[PDB]
Amino acid sequence: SIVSKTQKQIKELQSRIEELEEEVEAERQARGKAEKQRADLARELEEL
Amino acid sequence: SIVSKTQKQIKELQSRIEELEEEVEAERQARGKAEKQRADLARELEEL
16 A cells, blocks of 8 residues: 555656656747847847 | 665655756746846836
8 A cells, every 4th residue: 555655656746747847948938038039129229 | 675666766756856846946037037137128228
């Protein structure tokens, strides 16, 4: 019974790793968007 | 013996899940400071 209930734990904790991964590439794409959002806005500053 | 290995496995897989949450906060403060940087430069754009 100890084996049964912690196998459920290594089910979900390995499940959290594969779902915590999906916001690693997603909030990389935020930093892809955010740094590129300022870059044009930095560019319009200096030409002004 | 196999519940001992999962006892090793539940902590060494936990050793990665601490690192992956350590990264997801880092992109959070990065994207957090980025939206505050562009909100800062949005002010003096009109001033200039």
